[PDB]
């Protein structure tokens, strides 16, 4: 209802989807995704349209819509 479904594209083009509220700070998504890869979150960078997602960003603040895509990149050196 205020939820939207997001596809998180990981580095192997595998996908995990999250249903989150438009107002949810996106840190939970990052922490859940990094936990499921068995990797440190700070080894990862979560991008929405190339732009880094902060712990306090929300889907609404970022302008996310239904089925929008987050890409998970390896963090840079």
């Amino acid at each position: 209802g205020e939820y939207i479904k997001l596809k998180v594209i990981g580095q192997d083009s595998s996908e995990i989807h999250f249903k989150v509220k438009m107002t949810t700070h996106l840190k939970k998504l990052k922490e859940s995704y990094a936990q499921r890869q068995g990797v440190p979150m700070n080894s990862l960078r979560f991008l929405f349209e190339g732009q880094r997602i902060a712990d306090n960003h929300t889907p609404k603040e970022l302008g996310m819509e239904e089925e929008d895509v987050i890409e998970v990149y390896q963090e840079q050196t």
Partner: peptide, 10 residues
């Protein structure tokens, strides 16, 4: 390769 949906709590 199956679909994976996680529901997150606010």
């Amino acid at each position: 390769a199956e679909e994976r949906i996680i529901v997150l709590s606010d």
